[PDB]
Symmetry: C2
Subunit: 114 residues, 2 copies
């Protein structure tokens, strides 16, 4: 019960897109430690962005000045990816690291239209 396959997003070259990732339903007994956007491709994943309720926001290249958390909370890891291009197409994983229940990862496919 780890993976939660979500929507499928369709964006456009040049325009930005809103990738969605929220946590529901939040319980007081469950504590969210981190939200982590990763891009999966060719069978290999890649760290994209991380929101930590205490450590702040981190964006990793090539996604700095591109990816921005809209409502950075522990139940919301929604991001905006700027300047879509053909290389951006692929599977995206938004993972919540929670204690003591474990990790919940949402999974969404992104297609880039021309």
């Amino acid at each position: 019960q780890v993976v939660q396959v979500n929507d499928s997003m369709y964006g456009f070259i040049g325009t930005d897109v809103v990738l969605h990732c929220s946590f529901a339903n939040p319980l007081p007994s469950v504590k969210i430690t981190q939200v982590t956007w990763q891009k999966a491709s060719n069978g290999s994943k890649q760290n994209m962005a991380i929101y930590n309720p205490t450590m702040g926001v981190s964006v990793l290249p090539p996604y700095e000045k591109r990816v921005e958390f809209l409502r950075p909370s522990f139940i919301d890891g929604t991001i905006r990816l700027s300047g879509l291009e053909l290389e951006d197409e692929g599977m995206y994983i938004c993972e919540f690291a929670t204690f003591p229940t474990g990790n919940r990862e949402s999974q969404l496919n992104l297609t880039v239209m021309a």
Copy 2:
């Protein structure tokens, strides 16, 4: 980028196996927030055990009597799994949630013999 270790394991039925998992060297910039163990079986992830440096240890069913940390640290999530059943066959993933680097995981395939 997120997968740094890929190994294999073997063991007889009823015997105990020590699944190793560690991180070195975490840069002084890098902070480990949580360590998580997962099992992948026929396209489905399942949370096993979690060690959070600031919250403690949690062993989830049905592993609450079989799986155990040996030296639980922010750089060591090595566990022992006792009473190996045939169903235990498969890939096990030990994940380090870090900031600002993100997720760094180790995958090991445990095969059951007799």
